[PDB]
Design a protein around this ligand. Sequence first.
Ligand code: HEM
Ligand code: HEM
Ligand SMILES: C[C@H](O)[C@H](O)[C@H]1CNc2nc(N)[nH]c(=O)c2N1
Ligand SMILES: C[C@H](O)[C@H](O)[C@H]1CNc2nc(N)[nH]c(=O)c2N1
Ligand SMILES: [Zn+2]
Lengths: 414, 416
Amino acid sequence: KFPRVKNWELGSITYDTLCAQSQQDGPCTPRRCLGSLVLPRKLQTRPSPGPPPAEQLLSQARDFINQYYSSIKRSGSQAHEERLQEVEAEVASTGTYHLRESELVFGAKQAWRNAPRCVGRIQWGKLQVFDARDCSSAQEMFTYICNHIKYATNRGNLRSAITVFPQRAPGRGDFRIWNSQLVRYAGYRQQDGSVRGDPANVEITELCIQHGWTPGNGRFDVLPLLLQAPDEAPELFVLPPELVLEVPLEHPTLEWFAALGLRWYALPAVSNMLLEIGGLEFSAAPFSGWYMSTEIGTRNLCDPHRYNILEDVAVCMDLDTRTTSSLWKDKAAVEINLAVLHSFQLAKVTIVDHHAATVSFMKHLDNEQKARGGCPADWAWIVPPISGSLTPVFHQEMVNYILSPAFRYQPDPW
Amino acid sequence: GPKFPRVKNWELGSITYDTLCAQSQQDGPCTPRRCLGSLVLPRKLQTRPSPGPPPAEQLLSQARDFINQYYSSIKRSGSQAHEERLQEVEAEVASTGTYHLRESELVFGAKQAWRNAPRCVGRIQWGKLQVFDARDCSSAQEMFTYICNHIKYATNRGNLRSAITVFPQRAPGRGDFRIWNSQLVRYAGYRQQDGSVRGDPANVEITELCIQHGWTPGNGRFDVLPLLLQAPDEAPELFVLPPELVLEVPLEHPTLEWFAALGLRWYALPAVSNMLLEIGGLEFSAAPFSGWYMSTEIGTRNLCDPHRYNILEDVAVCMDLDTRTTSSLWKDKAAVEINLAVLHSFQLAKVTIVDHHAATVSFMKHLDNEQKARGGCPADWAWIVPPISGSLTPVFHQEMVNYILSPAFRYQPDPW
Ligand code: HEM
Ligand code: HEM
Ligand SMILES: C[C@H](O)[C@H](O)[C@H]1CNc2nc(N)[nH]c(=O)c2N1
Ligand SMILES: C[C@H](O)[C@H](O)[C@H]1CNc2nc(N)[nH]c(=O)c2N1
Ligand SMILES: [Zn+2]
């Protein structure tokens, strides 16, 4: 039942007993493993044709309340039994319930802790939770978002934060941030099918223009936010420049790197995922921490379907682009990730390289084994995009499963 | 849409459906509750030893399935020869309790096992495999002759050729034919007095077994080990491979002149020998196979792994990198030059080798070929994506479905 987990670098073994607490099913079966798929339509928390069955919601709620009181050690106190009574009364009468701010804070931190694809969970206990459940308009969503950004950025000394907007109600539309991240660069599909900017943001850039945004023509034009209040069309909001801290990229030894004009924002804030706590769903709950260098230098800048700068840098470095055997791609990529670490460190902006991050994740796995008897992790996401075996996580076996609270993927509002 | 796993390529945005997984009849380690896809040896890819013959009914169903596969590949499914062969197999199983393959059935099954191997990135070459039938072999000495012939053929003075030698299958009430070594060519791993290791740390055990069996050890980092060959119901016999048979490549860097001075090297022929070839329910406990290397296997894993040669620090010190901090990316820089050295040295010595870019690109082609041919291709993402420069490679952005198909190459417990 319980999987034997092994580290091949050190020969050490552990048994994951935490996976037994999983109540939600993944995409795999004994016939075939689908663990490398980014998003199966299954785990995804899509819309519904009404209110969840009261029995199911109630059991997820009682479970969460049980988790919370256990955390503060008051498991069994009258406060626990009374909170469970309150939840039952509210659900039975209204088909739903609401969380207290202390519970929402514990829930947000626990959802991060339970996030399989996250390599920075060693910081899970240090999270600023902004309660925005008293938001009623898109204009309000914007002020809360700007507050999140100003707080998280902190002049360069980044701080992990999450802003939780109103939960989903069966009788109305969701509060949604249409942008995948709070900060994104525009992607303009040119004449020749080409793309000026970030090709990953072509669809959202089009939507922004459609809703009245006057576009630019640069490779790094920060997009405005499309915030949606229940059953209302999304509204356009331009982010104040002083709020968006950006870092111009230059290399420590290659003088010509700066000339490439590359730059990336400091704040990584995912804004399209759904936070589920005790059966309650928060369709708008942007979260942010700090970047791991490979996200920018390898994925964002070197992916073929992204900025695709590999060959440009290779030519500047004057490498042999004729054959793959010269390893020109590998050489260019290393210098690009180096430029990212150098530039952010020069600008006094928080980053963490993949070696430092993965070593900390290994410590986190150890903390978790002793604390909960395991830790759900997605090997394909945890192992960085370059120099995989050069990091300790590559040599670590991992067990992946879904625990709640959890951040889940959800359908696009359009 | 369709009731089969939807597979996507994120670089190109293309979609495909895996229908081939529908043919899988062997369960993997995963369940709807948890994914155990990253485990090297879950007890689902490993064939334990059968001290007793497989139940006639279970074996016969596996046998029928294989015969059906064979006749389908030659396009004579449902034919007279097909129904005859099926009858012939159940006749053998009826009286003897086992059966035997025809020459062409073994060649087909051996090629299909490679084709079905989820952890192999070189499957674009699956149709070109030299199958040596050694099912007549009766002694440990003969196994040696066969292995030596295999090495000569496969090595071909640098112009490597994929090959596999199949020894007699598992027989009920008789010992197995087993090659104790993990590969035909392995470097010794000497356990030092202080606790460290000289040579290859991966080979500490087998080295100790060779010593317990009469081998007189050396004291270098790259000492080729002798073979511990086992014939049925007999103790393993030690056989030293003649030096001229084992082609090696001294490592040197194209620009970093001091790299040659490091005295590093690696053998040309990658030949796995501790794996079990399962065809139609028949188990070939000894069936070494070989191809050619992918640069990262040597330069990244064998030479840079912390539990292997671990040379990253040595090379970084020579390149004068800041090994005091992670942010200098000294490990990344060094590893790149080490991989470049492996590629350069093999090309210079005219020994076949393929870099991780070329190999993965050819695996994408294979994936496209198999989509059209079988409606999918079982692939282990963790093993298909190279140990360095993952996303710079096209397979990283390719979702894969993993399942067990037979014939198959399966793990098996150590003879000892
Ligand atoms: C403290 C700094 C942190 C670092 C360095 C870090 C790093 C990472 C990395 C490398 C990824 C993969 C990103 C990608 O490839 O798209 C990731 C994903 C993720 N992280 Fe963390 N993380 C941190 C903080 C956070 C915080 C504050 C939360 C939530 C409260 C969080 C939630 C997650 C989740 C849910 C994912 C999956 C994202 C997705 O599926 O797109 N992370 N993190
Ligand atoms: C023609 C060249 C070939 C190349 C470049 C190639 C490359 C690879 C690579 C890189 C691996 C990973 C090994 C590791 O990381 O330990 C692998 C695994 C494997 N290959 Fe291939 N391969 C080729 C030929 C063969 C042949 C001839 C067979 C069999 C007839 C084969 C069967 C397999 C199997 C079953 C594995 C699994 C390894 C394990 O489970 O330990 N390959 N191959
Ligand atoms: C197909 C494959 O799952 C996909 O390319 C994954 C692999 N690992 C990843 N890992 C991280 N951190 N982020 C990603 O976007 C991906 N993409
Ligand atoms: C734990 C993890 O499965 C293990 O380190 C795997 C990862 N991917 C691999 N991939 C290949 N090709 N070869 C290996 O030996 C491994 N080891
Ligand atoms: Zn799985």
